[PDB]
Design a protein around this ligand. Structure first.
Ligand SMILES: O=C(O)c1cc2ccccc2o1
Length: 126
């Protein structure tokens, strides 16, 4: 069901949370080789999460589930904010700009924490 597809998508999201926090520790410790690998892992996880979210939104639309579509449109918009900040973080790492990397890292944490009540609302709505 779309609800079980959302729980699978939520688990991929939690995997990125786990990898992100390990990456933050590696960045603080200066282990740039680890950071590079974690950033590649995160890019793959976010790409997967995005695709799963789009399929869920499209299914909710085909089902006529207006409330779930509304929430998923809001949630996918916030997802793109996080993705843009993530991409900027990756660029800051490539460029060696640790100040910008720190900035974007905190921003990605706040954007993600803000979107959590909505994430839970969607599970109930589908
Ligand atoms: O739900 C997600 O795909 C997600 C959450 C998150 C938090 C920090 C960095 C990357 C992230 O991806």
């Amino acid at each position: 069901s779309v609800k079980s597809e959302y729980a699978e998508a939520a688990a991929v999201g939690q995997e990125a949370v786990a990898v992100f926090n390990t990456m933050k520790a590696a960045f603080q410790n200066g282990d740039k080789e680890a950071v590079a690998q974690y950033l590649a892992r995160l890019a793959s996880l976010y790409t997967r999460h995005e695709e799963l979210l789009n399929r869920i939104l499209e299914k909710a639309r085909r089902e006529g589930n207006k409330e779930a579509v509304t929430l998923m449109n809001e949630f996918t918009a916030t997802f793109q904010t996080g993705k843009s900040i993530f991409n900027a973080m990756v660029a800051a790492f490539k460029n060696g700009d640790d100040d910008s990397f720190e900035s974007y890292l905190q921003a990605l944490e706040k954007v993600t924490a803000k979107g959590e009540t909505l994430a839970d609302q969607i599970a109930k709505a589908l």
